[PDB]
Amino acid sequence: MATLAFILYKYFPFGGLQRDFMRIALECQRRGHDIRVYTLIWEGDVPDGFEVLVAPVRSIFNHRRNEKFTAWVRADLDRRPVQRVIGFNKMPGLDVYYAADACFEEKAQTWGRYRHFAGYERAVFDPASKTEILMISEVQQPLFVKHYGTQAERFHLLPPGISQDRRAPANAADVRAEFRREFGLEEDDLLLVQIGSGFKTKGLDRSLKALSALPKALRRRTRLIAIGQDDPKPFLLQIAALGLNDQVQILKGRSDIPRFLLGADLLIHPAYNENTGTVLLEALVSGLPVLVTDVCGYAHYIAEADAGRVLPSPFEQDSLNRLLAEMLEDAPARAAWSRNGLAYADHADLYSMPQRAADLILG
Ligand SMILES: O=c1ccn([C@@H]2O[C@H](COP(=O)(O)OP(=O)(O)O[C@H]3O[C@H](CO)[C@H](O)[C@H](O)[C@H]3O)[C@@H](O)[C@H]2O)c(=O)[nH]1
């Protein structure tokens, strides 16, 4: 058979892991392979030719639900074999694992849950495992080796896989204008965007503080839009307390991210932690200056392209506050950062991930 089985716990269109999966699966499909997907949930369109299997397993604890998932999948595969098994979450029985997550053991070293997630990571990374690993954050490889001793030859570093529709188009100025008209933004207004479905760990709380803390002249001109498949309710108290009710909107998952990237004035991403941060590069290729914490795996790109500022660790609210103020005050610097991002996008390989992953998956 030429069937490839792709395994991920959750498909939905507004996540990095999920979009990377989709691009790899579509590339492998174009190369003559039918696609089977095993998942706990599939939200949104199913592409032609994808055989999507949603597990009927249930458990009160997610970690136990995941083990039941593995048994369910392995029983299906035993009955209906495939050419290769590619997982986007850590579990036993993968031929290939795409490391969309950072090293768990490292995070834990900051009971049933811990043992499950450590055991599933070990199932991939143990030296007796045969799983081949597609890395997307370079910084994580030494940590997997530290914790499991994984052989060097099993790791394959991929370049970024930013989709084409995020690159600034020929009519960028028209898209910007139409966006700003729609949202009621005038030339003297400043729009911050915080993009990604995980507002807490991506530091929406720090973004709101920095917005609140701006000097009066900037604070009056500036608004924030957060975009993600995430609950806004927990931030509403903070927004009211900071007096920002009229300056902040939180939207659900959107498929028109490129319009926000062209229409905004800064991307703010002061994440607590972030394996890579695709949105960081999407801002860069859009010419949108970025303010990001150094812990993000893709932060180095912002620094090296000089397409915004990276805030060094340890995190201090006061430094974020000050950096945001300094970036919004300096319109020449923002114009340079924008130019720098666009020029870097024309030279650097930020696009080829799905082809490279497919080459490794299929030999
Ligand atoms: O409303 C939304 C919100 C997000 N996105 C898209 O979803 C992706 C988000 O990817 P990020 O890496 O920025 O963030 P995630 O947290 O969703 O992604 C996860 O997987 C990534 C790639 O596999 C990285 O490893 C990352 O650190 C990890 O948290 C981007 O293409 C972004 O444009 C949308 O299309 N619509």
Side-chain angles (χ1 to χ4, degrees), residues 178-213:
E178 155 62 18
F179 176 83
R180 291 180 73 89
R181 199 204 87 291
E182 188 179 303
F183 282 78
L185 288 155
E186 308 185 315
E187 273 298 82
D188 51 332
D189 298 322
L190 295 167
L191 172 61
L192 309 188
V193 287
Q194 192 173 315
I195 302 182
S197 310
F199 298 148
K200 203 282 156 190
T201 76
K202 294 178 188 285
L204 178 57
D205 83 286
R206 296 157 161 191
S207 288
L208 292 169
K209 285 176 191 162
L211 174 57
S212 198

PDB file of all heavy atoms in Angstrom, residues 178-213:
ATOM      1  N   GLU A 178      -7.727  48.719   3.172  1.00  0.00           N
ATOM      2  CA  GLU A 178      -9.059  48.136   3.277  1.00  0.00           C
ATOM      3  C   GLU A 178      -9.253  47.583   4.685  1.00  0.00           C
ATOM      4  O   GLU A 178     -10.288  47.814   5.297  1.00  0.00           O
ATOM      5  CB  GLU A 178      -9.249  47.101   2.165  1.00  0.00           C
ATOM      6  CG  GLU A 178     -10.279  46.018   2.470  1.00  0.00           C
ATOM      7  CD  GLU A 178     -11.718  46.457   2.693  1.00  0.00           C
ATOM      8  OE1 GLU A 178     -12.062  47.598   2.298  1.00  0.00           O
ATOM      9  OE2 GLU A 178     -12.501  45.649   3.249  1.00  0.00           O
ATOM     10  N   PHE A 179      -8.214  46.926   5.222  1.00  0.00           N
ATOM     11  CA  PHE A 179      -8.236  46.439   6.587  1.00  0.00           C
ATOM     12  C   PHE A 179      -8.436  47.593   7.580  1.00  0.00           C
ATOM     13  O   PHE A 179      -9.305  47.535   8.457  1.00  0.00           O
ATOM     14  CB  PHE A 179      -6.968  45.644   6.931  1.00  0.00           C
ATOM     15  CG  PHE A 179      -6.939  45.203   8.376  1.00  0.00           C
ATOM     16  CD1 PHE A 179      -7.610  44.053   8.773  1.00  0.00           C
ATOM     17  CD2 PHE A 179      -6.323  45.982   9.349  1.00  0.00           C
ATOM     18  CE1 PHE A 179      -7.619  43.666  10.106  1.00  0.00           C
ATOM     19  CE2 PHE A 179      -6.314  45.590  10.676  1.00  0.00           C
ATOM     20  CZ  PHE A 179      -6.990  44.447  11.059  1.00  0.00           C
ATOM     21  N   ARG A 180      -7.603  48.624   7.479  1.00  0.00           N
ATOM     22  CA  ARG A 180      -7.651  49.709   8.443  1.00  0.00           C
ATOM     23  C   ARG A 180      -8.982  50.456   8.338  1.00  0.00           C
ATOM     24  O   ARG A 180      -9.528  50.837   9.358  1.00  0.00           O
ATOM     25  CB  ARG A 180      -6.418  50.599   8.289  1.00  0.00           C
ATOM     26  CG  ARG A 180      -5.149  49.889   8.741  1.00  0.00           C
ATOM     27  CD  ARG A 180      -3.908  50.770   8.605  1.00  0.00           C
ATOM     28  NE  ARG A 180      -3.785  51.860   9.577  1.00  0.00           N
ATOM     29  CZ  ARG A 180      -3.199  51.761  10.760  1.00  0.00           C
ATOM     30  NH1 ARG A 180      -2.776  50.584  11.198  1.00  0.00           N
ATOM     31  NH2 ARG A 180      -3.004  52.856  11.477  1.00  0.00           N
ATOM     32  N   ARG A 181      -9.527  50.608   7.131  1.00  0.00           N
ATOM     33  CA  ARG A 181     -10.864  51.169   6.963  1.00  0.00           C
ATOM     34  C   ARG A 181     -11.874  50.316   7.727  1.00  0.00           C
ATOM     35  O   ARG A 181     -12.666  50.826   8.527  1.00  0.00           O
ATOM     36  CB  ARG A 181     -11.201  51.305   5.472  1.00  0.00           C
ATOM     37  CG  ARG A 181     -12.347  52.261   5.158  1.00  0.00           C
ATOM     38  CD  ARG A 181     -13.024  51.945   3.838  1.00  0.00           C
ATOM     39  NE  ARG A 181     -14.077  50.946   4.031  1.00  0.00           N
ATOM     40  CZ  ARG A 181     -13.889  49.659   4.349  1.00  0.00           C
ATOM     41  NH1 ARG A 181     -12.733  49.061   4.114  1.00  0.00           N
ATOM     42  NH2 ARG A 181     -14.890  48.949   4.846  1.00  0.00           N
ATOM     43  N   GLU A 182     -11.809  49.004   7.527  1.00  0.00           N
ATOM     44  CA  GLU A 182     -12.797  48.116   8.111  1.00  0.00           C
ATOM     45  C   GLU A 182     -12.790  48.224   9.638  1.00  0.00           C
ATOM     46  O   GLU A 182     -13.847  48.349  10.254  1.00  0.00           O
ATOM     47  CB  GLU A 182     -12.552  46.693   7.625  1.00  0.00           C
ATOM     48  CG  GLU A 182     -13.646  45.720   8.032  1.00  0.00           C
ATOM     49  CD  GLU A 182     -13.379  44.320   7.512  1.00  0.00           C
ATOM     50  OE1 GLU A 182     -13.230  44.174   6.254  1.00  0.00           O
ATOM     51  OE2 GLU A 182     -13.284  43.403   8.353  1.00  0.00           O
ATOM     52  N   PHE A 183     -11.600  48.201  10.249  1.00  0.00           N
ATOM     53  CA  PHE A 183     -11.480  48.234  11.702  1.00  0.00           C
ATOM     54  C   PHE A 183     -11.523  49.666  12.256  1.00  0.00           C
ATOM     55  O   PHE A 183     -11.429  49.841  13.477  1.00  0.00           O
ATOM     56  CB  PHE A 183     -10.251  47.417  12.137  1.00  0.00           C
ATOM     57  CG  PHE A 183     -10.510  45.934  12.118  1.00  0.00           C
ATOM     58  CD1 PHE A 183     -10.513  45.227  10.924  1.00  0.00           C
ATOM     59  CD2 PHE A 183     -10.863  45.263  13.281  1.00  0.00           C
ATOM     60  CE1 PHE A 183     -10.826  43.868  10.890  1.00  0.00           C
ATOM     61  CE2 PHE A 183     -11.173  43.909  13.248  1.00  0.00           C
ATOM     62  CZ  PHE A 183     -11.146  43.212  12.054  1.00  0.00           C
ATOM     63  N   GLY A 184     -11.681  50.673  11.383  1.00  0.00           N
ATOM     64  CA  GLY A 184     -11.769  52.065  11.801  1.00  0.00           C
ATOM     65  C   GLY A 184     -10.428  52.657  12.265  1.00  0.00           C
ATOM     66  O   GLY A 184     -10.396  53.507  13.148  1.00  0.00           O
ATOM     67  N   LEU A 185      -9.313  52.223  11.660  1.00  0.00           N
ATOM     68  CA  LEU A 185      -8.006  52.711  12.077  1.00  0.00           C
ATOM     69  C   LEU A 185      -7.559  53.819  11.128  1.00  0.00           C
ATOM     70  O   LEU A 185      -7.552  53.651   9.908  1.00  0.00           O
ATOM     71  CB  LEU A 185      -6.984  51.565  12.076  1.00  0.00           C
ATOM     72  CG  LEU A 185      -7.131  50.522  13.185  1.00  0.00           C
ATOM     73  CD1 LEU A 185      -6.530  49.201  12.750  1.00  0.00           C
ATOM     74  CD2 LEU A 185      -6.465  50.992  14.466  1.00  0.00           C
ATOM     75  N   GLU A 186      -7.131  54.930  11.711  1.00  0.00           N
ATOM     76  CA  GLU A 186      -6.663  56.067  10.933  1.00  0.00           C
ATOM     77  C   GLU A 186      -5.136  56.095  10.947  1.00  0.00           C
ATOM     78  O   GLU A 186      -4.494  55.358  11.692  1.00  0.00           O
ATOM     79  CB  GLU A 186      -7.301  57.331  11.512  1.00  0.00           C
ATOM     80  CG  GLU A 186      -8.811  57.223  11.642  1.00  0.00           C
ATOM     81  CD  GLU A 186      -9.522  58.482  12.103  1.00  0.00           C
ATOM     82  OE1 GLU A 186      -9.017  59.116  13.082  1.00  0.00           O
ATOM     83  OE2 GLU A 186     -10.615  58.787  11.532  1.00  0.00           O
ATOM     84  N   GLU A 187      -4.557  57.006  10.159  1.00  0.00           N
ATOM     85  CA  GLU A 187      -3.112  57.042   9.929  1.00  0.00           C
ATOM     86  C   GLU A 187      -2.328  57.241  11.221  1.00  0.00           C
ATOM     87  O   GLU A 187      -1.211  56.758  11.326  1.00  0.00           O
ATOM     88  CB  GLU A 187      -2.763  58.116   8.896  1.00  0.00           C
ATOM     89  CG  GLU A 187      -2.839  57.580   7.484  1.00  0.00           C
ATOM     90  CD  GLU A 187      -1.848  56.444   7.236  1.00  0.00           C
ATOM     91  OE1 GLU A 187      -2.137  55.262   7.599  1.00  0.00           O
ATOM     92  OE2 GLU A 187      -0.765  56.740   6.696  1.00  0.00           O
ATOM     93  N   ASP A 188      -2.905  57.946  12.196  1.00  0.00           N
ATOM     94  CA  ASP A 188      -2.209  58.257  13.437  1.00  0.00           C
ATOM     95  C   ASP A 188      -2.478  57.225  14.530  1.00  0.00           C
ATOM     96  O   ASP A 188      -1.939  57.349  15.625  1.00  0.00           O
ATOM     97  CB  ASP A 188      -2.542  59.670  13.920  1.00  0.00           C
ATOM     98  CG  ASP A 188      -4.016  60.019  14.008  1.00  0.00           C
ATOM     99  OD1 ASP A 188      -4.837  59.439  13.250  1.00  0.00           O
ATOM    100  OD2 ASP A 188      -4.332  60.840  14.865  1.00  0.00           O
ATOM    101  N   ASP A 189      -3.292  56.202  14.230  1.00  0.00           N
ATOM    102  CA  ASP A 189      -3.568  55.124  15.160  1.00  0.00           C
ATOM    103  C   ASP A 189      -2.465  54.071  15.049  1.00  0.00           C
ATOM    104  O   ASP A 189      -1.909  53.860  13.977  1.00  0.00           O
ATOM    105  CB  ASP A 189      -4.960  54.511  14.901  1.00  0.00           C
ATOM    106  CG  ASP A 189      -6.123  55.482  15.080  1.00  0.00           C
ATOM    107  OD1 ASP A 189      -6.060  56.306  16.002  1.00  0.00           O
ATOM    108  OD2 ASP A 189      -7.118  55.351  14.346  1.00  0.00           O
ATOM    109  N   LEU A 190      -2.188  53.389  16.172  1.00  0.00           N
ATOM    110  CA  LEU A 190      -1.236  52.281  16.229  1.00  0.00           C
ATOM    111  C   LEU A 190      -1.957  50.989  16.628  1.00  0.00           C
ATOM    112  O   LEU A 190      -2.638  50.953  17.643  1.00  0.00           O
ATOM    113  CB  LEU A 190      -0.146  52.634  17.251  1.00  0.00           C
ATOM    114  CG  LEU A 190       0.722  53.835  16.871  1.00  0.00           C
ATOM    115  CD1 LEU A 190       1.542  54.306  18.079  1.00  0.00           C
ATOM    116  CD2 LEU A 190       1.619  53.498  15.679  1.00  0.00           C
ATOM    117  N   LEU A 191      -1.823  49.937  15.807  1.00  0.00           N
ATOM    118  CA  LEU A 191      -2.439  48.655  16.098  1.00  0.00           C
ATOM    119  C   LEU A 191      -1.358  47.646  16.483  1.00  0.00           C
ATOM    120  O   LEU A 191      -0.437  47.392  15.712  1.00  0.00           O
ATOM    121  CB  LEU A 191      -3.247  48.162  14.887  1.00  0.00           C
ATOM    122  CG  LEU A 191      -3.771  46.731  15.018  1.00  0.00           C
ATOM    123  CD1 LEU A 191      -4.721  46.600  16.202  1.00  0.00           C
ATOM    124  CD2 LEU A 191      -4.445  46.255  13.743  1.00  0.00           C
ATOM    125  N   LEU A 192      -1.471  47.103  17.702  1.00  0.00           N
ATOM    126  CA  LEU A 192      -0.713  45.943  18.135  1.00  0.00           C
ATOM    127  C   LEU A 192      -1.525  44.689  17.833  1.00  0.00           C
ATOM    128  O   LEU A 192      -2.720  44.643  18.139  1.00  0.00           O
ATOM    129  CB  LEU A 192      -0.514  46.060  19.645  1.00  0.00           C
ATOM    130  CG  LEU A 192       0.044  47.387  20.153  1.00  0.00           C
ATOM    131  CD1 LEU A 192       0.378  47.283  21.639  1.00  0.00           C
ATOM    132  CD2 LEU A 192       1.264  47.802  19.349  1.00  0.00           C
ATOM    133  N   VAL A 193      -0.890  43.651  17.284  1.00  0.00           N
ATOM    134  CA  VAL A 193      -1.592  42.380  17.158  1.00  0.00           C
ATOM    135  C   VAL A 193      -0.855  41.312  17.952  1.00  0.00           C
ATOM    136  O   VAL A 193       0.374  41.223  17.909  1.00  0.00           O
ATOM    137  CB  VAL A 193      -1.839  41.948  15.693  1.00  0.00           C
ATOM    138  CG1 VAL A 193      -2.918  42.794  15.034  1.00  0.00           C
ATOM    139  CG2 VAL A 193      -0.577  41.946  14.846  1.00  0.00           C
ATOM    140  N   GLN A 194      -1.631  40.529  18.711  1.00  0.00           N
ATOM    141  CA  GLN A 194      -1.116  39.324  19.327  1.00  0.00           C
ATOM    142  C   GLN A 194      -1.846  38.118  18.755  1.00  0.00           C
ATOM    143  O   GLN A 194      -3.058  38.001  18.926  1.00  0.00           O
ATOM    144  CB  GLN A 194      -1.215  39.301  20.840  1.00  0.00           C
ATOM    145  CG  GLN A 194      -0.373  38.142  21.350  1.00  0.00           C
ATOM    146  CD  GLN A 194      -0.242  38.095  22.836  1.00  0.00           C
ATOM    147  OE1 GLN A 194       0.009  39.111  23.486  1.00  0.00           O
ATOM    148  NE2 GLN A 194      -0.533  36.919  23.358  1.00  0.00           N
ATOM    149  N   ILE A 195      -1.104  37.267  18.041  1.00  0.00           N
ATOM    150  CA  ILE A 195      -1.731  36.239  17.215  1.00  0.00           C
ATOM    151  C   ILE A 195      -1.303  34.862  17.717  1.00  0.00           C
ATOM    152  O   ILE A 195      -0.109  34.586  17.817  1.00  0.00           O
ATOM    153  CB  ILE A 195      -1.391  36.438  15.723  1.00  0.00           C
ATOM    154  CG1 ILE A 195      -1.832  37.820  15.236  1.00  0.00           C
ATOM    155  CG2 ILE A 195      -2.023  35.367  14.854  1.00  0.00           C
ATOM    156  CD1 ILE A 195      -1.558  38.036  13.756  1.00  0.00           C
ATOM    157  N   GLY A 196      -2.292  34.001  17.962  1.00  0.00           N
ATOM    158  CA  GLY A 196      -2.046  32.596  18.261  1.00  0.00           C
ATOM    159  C   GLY A 196      -2.976  32.077  19.355  1.00  0.00           C
ATOM    160  O   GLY A 196      -3.241  32.801  20.329  1.00  0.00           O
ATOM    161  N   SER A 197      -3.458  30.832  19.144  1.00  0.00           N
ATOM    162  CA  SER A 197      -4.405  30.133  20.007  1.00  0.00           C
ATOM    163  C   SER A 197      -3.683  29.557  21.223  1.00  0.00           C
ATOM    164  O   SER A 197      -3.401  28.364  21.289  1.00  0.00           O
ATOM    165  CB  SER A 197      -5.155  29.044  19.242  1.00  0.00           C
ATOM    166  OG  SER A 197      -5.709  29.556  18.016  1.00  0.00           O
ATOM    167  N   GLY A 198      -3.412  30.421  22.196  1.00  0.00           N
ATOM    168  CA  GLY A 198      -2.863  30.029  23.487  1.00  0.00           C
ATOM    169  C   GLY A 198      -2.453  31.287  24.239  1.00  0.00           C
ATOM    170  O   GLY A 198      -1.277  31.543  24.425  1.00  0.00           O
ATOM    171  N   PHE A 199      -3.441  32.105  24.600  1.00  0.00           N
ATOM    172  CA  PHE A 199      -3.167  33.480  24.953  1.00  0.00           C
ATOM    173  C   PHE A 199      -2.321  33.553  26.218  1.00  0.00           C
ATOM    174  O   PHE A 199      -1.454  34.419  26.331  1.00  0.00           O
ATOM    175  CB  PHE A 199      -4.462  34.258  25.187  1.00  0.00           C
ATOM    176  CG  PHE A 199      -5.400  34.373  24.015  1.00  0.00           C
ATOM    177  CD1 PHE A 199      -6.771  34.435  24.239  1.00  0.00           C
ATOM    178  CD2 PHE A 199      -4.930  34.528  22.718  1.00  0.00           C
ATOM    179  CE1 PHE A 199      -7.659  34.606  23.187  1.00  0.00           C
ATOM    180  CE2 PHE A 199      -5.822  34.704  21.669  1.00  0.00           C
ATOM    181  CZ  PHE A 199      -7.180  34.733  21.901  1.00  0.00           C
ATOM    182  N   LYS A 200      -2.561  32.637  27.152  1.00  0.00           N
ATOM    183  CA  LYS A 200      -1.877  32.684  28.442  1.00  0.00           C
ATOM    184  C   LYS A 200      -0.364  32.552  28.255  1.00  0.00           C
ATOM    185  O   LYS A 200       0.394  33.431  28.687  1.00  0.00           O
ATOM    186  CB  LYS A 200      -2.427  31.618  29.401  1.00  0.00           C
ATOM    187  CG  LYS A 200      -2.215  31.904  30.885  1.00  0.00           C
ATOM    188  CD  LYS A 200      -0.808  31.627  31.409  1.00  0.00           C
ATOM    189  CE  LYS A 200      -0.426  32.406  32.659  1.00  0.00           C
ATOM    190  NZ  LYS A 200       1.025  32.269  32.953  1.00  0.00           N
ATOM    191  N   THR A 201       0.087  31.453  27.623  1.00  0.00           N
ATOM    192  CA  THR A 201       1.514  31.156  27.545  1.00  0.00           C
ATOM    193  C   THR A 201       2.211  32.065  26.530  1.00  0.00           C
ATOM    194  O   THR A 201       3.417  32.258  26.610  1.00  0.00           O
ATOM    195  CB  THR A 201       1.798  29.673  27.257  1.00  0.00           C
ATOM    196  OG1 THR A 201       1.537  29.407  25.888  1.00  0.00           O
ATOM    197  CG2 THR A 201       0.984  28.726  28.098  1.00  0.00           C
ATOM    198  N   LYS A 202       1.442  32.655  25.601  1.00  0.00           N
ATOM    199  CA  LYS A 202       1.964  33.596  24.614  1.00  0.00           C
ATOM    200  C   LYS A 202       2.048  35.007  25.210  1.00  0.00           C
ATOM    201  O   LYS A 202       2.520  35.936  24.555  1.00  0.00           O
ATOM    202  CB  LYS A 202       1.121  33.521  23.329  1.00  0.00           C
ATOM    203  CG  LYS A 202       1.259  32.171  22.617  1.00  0.00           C
ATOM    204  CD  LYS A 202       0.437  31.987  21.374  1.00  0.00           C
ATOM    205  CE  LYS A 202       0.481  30.572  20.826  1.00  0.00           C
ATOM    206  NZ  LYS A 202       1.764  30.297  20.152  1.00  0.00           N
ATOM    207  N   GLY A 203       1.590  35.160  26.459  1.00  0.00           N
ATOM    208  CA  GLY A 203       1.855  36.364  27.224  1.00  0.00           C
ATOM    209  C   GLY A 203       0.869  37.499  26.948  1.00  0.00           C
ATOM    210  O   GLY A 203       1.262  38.659  27.063  1.00  0.00           O
ATOM    211  N   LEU A 204      -0.391  37.179  26.604  1.00  0.00           N
ATOM    212  CA  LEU A 204      -1.405  38.225  26.454  1.00  0.00           C
ATOM    213  C   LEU A 204      -1.453  39.104  27.713  1.00  0.00           C
ATOM    214  O   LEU A 204      -1.600  40.312  27.587  1.00  0.00           O
ATOM    215  CB  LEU A 204      -2.785  37.633  26.156  1.00  0.00           C
ATOM    216  CG  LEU A 204      -3.933  38.641  26.032  1.00  0.00           C
ATOM    217  CD1 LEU A 204      -3.641  39.686  24.955  1.00  0.00           C
ATOM    218  CD2 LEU A 204      -5.249  37.942  25.735  1.00  0.00           C
ATOM    219  N   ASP A 205      -1.279  38.518  28.907  1.00  0.00           N
ATOM    220  CA  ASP A 205      -1.315  39.300  30.138  1.00  0.00           C
ATOM    221  C   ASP A 205      -0.199  40.351  30.164  1.00  0.00           C
ATOM    222  O   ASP A 205      -0.416  41.449  30.672  1.00  0.00           O
ATOM    223  CB  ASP A 205      -1.302  38.414  31.392  1.00  0.00           C
ATOM    224  CG  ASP A 205       0.085  37.949  31.811  1.00  0.00           C
ATOM    225  OD1 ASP A 205       0.650  37.061  31.129  1.00  0.00           O
ATOM    226  OD2 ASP A 205       0.624  38.525  32.788  1.00  0.00           O
ATOM    227  N   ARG A 206       0.993  40.036  29.622  1.00  0.00           N
ATOM    228  CA  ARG A 206       2.117  40.975  29.609  1.00  0.00           C
ATOM    229  C   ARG A 206       1.884  42.077  28.573  1.00  0.00           C
ATOM    230  O   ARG A 206       2.235  43.246  28.780  1.00  0.00           O
ATOM    231  CB  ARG A 206       3.429  40.230  29.313  1.00  0.00           C
ATOM    232  CG  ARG A 206       3.849  39.214  30.377  1.00  0.00           C
ATOM    233  CD  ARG A 206       4.779  38.183  29.762  1.00  0.00           C
ATOM    234  NE  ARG A 206       5.558  37.456  30.752  1.00  0.00           N
ATOM    235  CZ  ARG A 206       6.589  36.641  30.498  1.00  0.00           C
ATOM    236  NH1 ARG A 206       6.925  36.259  29.271  1.00  0.00           N
ATOM    237  NH2 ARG A 206       7.266  36.162  31.522  1.00  0.00           N
ATOM    238  N   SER A 207       1.296  41.678  27.440  1.00  0.00           N
ATOM    239  CA  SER A 207       0.947  42.601  26.374  1.00  0.00           C
ATOM    240  C   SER A 207      -0.007  43.671  26.905  1.00  0.00           C
ATOM    241  O   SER A 207       0.209  44.844  26.645  1.00  0.00           O
ATOM    242  CB  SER A 207       0.395  41.845  25.180  1.00  0.00           C
ATOM    243  OG  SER A 207       1.426  41.129  24.504  1.00  0.00           O
ATOM    244  N   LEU A 208      -1.023  43.266  27.670  1.00  0.00           N
ATOM    245  CA  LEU A 208      -2.039  44.181  28.187  1.00  0.00           C
ATOM    246  C   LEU A 208      -1.432  45.181  29.177  1.00  0.00           C
ATOM    247  O   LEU A 208      -1.746  46.368  29.138  1.00  0.00           O
ATOM    248  CB  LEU A 208      -3.151  43.365  28.852  1.00  0.00           C
ATOM    249  CG  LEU A 208      -3.987  42.533  27.883  1.00  0.00           C
ATOM    250  CD1 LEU A 208      -4.875  41.550  28.621  1.00  0.00           C
ATOM    251  CD2 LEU A 208      -4.804  43.429  26.988  1.00  0.00           C
ATOM    252  N   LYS A 209      -0.551  44.691  30.050  1.00  0.00           N
ATOM    253  CA  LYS A 209       0.177  45.552  30.973  1.00  0.00           C
ATOM    254  C   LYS A 209       1.016  46.585  30.225  1.00  0.00           C
ATOM    255  O   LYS A 209       1.034  47.753  30.606  1.00  0.00           O
ATOM    256  CB  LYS A 209       1.033  44.691  31.909  1.00  0.00           C
ATOM    257  CG  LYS A 209       0.214  44.000  32.978  1.00  0.00           C
ATOM    258  CD  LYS A 209       1.003  43.083  33.843  1.00  0.00           C
ATOM    259  CE  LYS A 209       0.086  42.231  34.687  1.00  0.00           C
ATOM    260  NZ  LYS A 209       0.822  41.061  35.210  1.00  0.00           N
ATOM    261  N   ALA A 210       1.707  46.165  29.163  1.00  0.00           N
ATOM    262  CA  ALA A 210       2.581  47.065  28.413  1.00  0.00           C
ATOM    263  C   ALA A 210       1.775  48.144  27.674  1.00  0.00           C
ATOM    264  O   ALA A 210       2.208  49.296  27.547  1.00  0.00           O
ATOM    265  CB  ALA A 210       3.427  46.248  27.473  1.00  0.00           C
ATOM    266  N   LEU A 211       0.594  47.750  27.174  1.00  0.00           N
ATOM    267  CA  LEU A 211      -0.345  48.670  26.536  1.00  0.00           C
ATOM    268  C   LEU A 211      -0.820  49.729  27.548  1.00  0.00           C
ATOM    269  O   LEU A 211      -0.822  50.928  27.250  1.00  0.00           O
ATOM    270  CB  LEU A 211      -1.512  47.854  25.950  1.00  0.00           C
ATOM    271  CG  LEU A 211      -2.677  48.655  25.358  1.00  0.00           C
ATOM    272  CD1 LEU A 211      -2.204  49.594  24.268  1.00  0.00           C
ATOM    273  CD2 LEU A 211      -3.782  47.727  24.825  1.00  0.00           C
ATOM    274  N   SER A 212      -1.228  49.266  28.736  1.00  0.00           N
ATOM    275  CA  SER A 212      -1.687  50.121  29.823  1.00  0.00           C
ATOM    276  C   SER A 212      -0.590  51.087  30.281  1.00  0.00           C
ATOM    277  O   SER A 212      -0.862  52.258  30.550  1.00  0.00           O
ATOM    278  CB  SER A 212      -2.162  49.283  30.974  1.00  0.00           C
ATOM    279  OG  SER A 212      -2.977  50.063  31.833  1.00  0.00           O
ATOM    280  N   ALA A 213       0.660  50.608  30.318  1.00  0.00           N
ATOM    281  CA  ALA A 213       1.761  51.360  30.884  1.00  0.00           C
ATOM    282  C   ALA A 213       2.330  52.407  29.928  1.00  0.00           C
ATOM    283  O   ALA A 213       3.284  53.084  30.281  1.00  0.00           O
ATOM    284  CB  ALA A 213       2.821  50.393  31.333  1.00  0.00           C
TER     285      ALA A 213
END
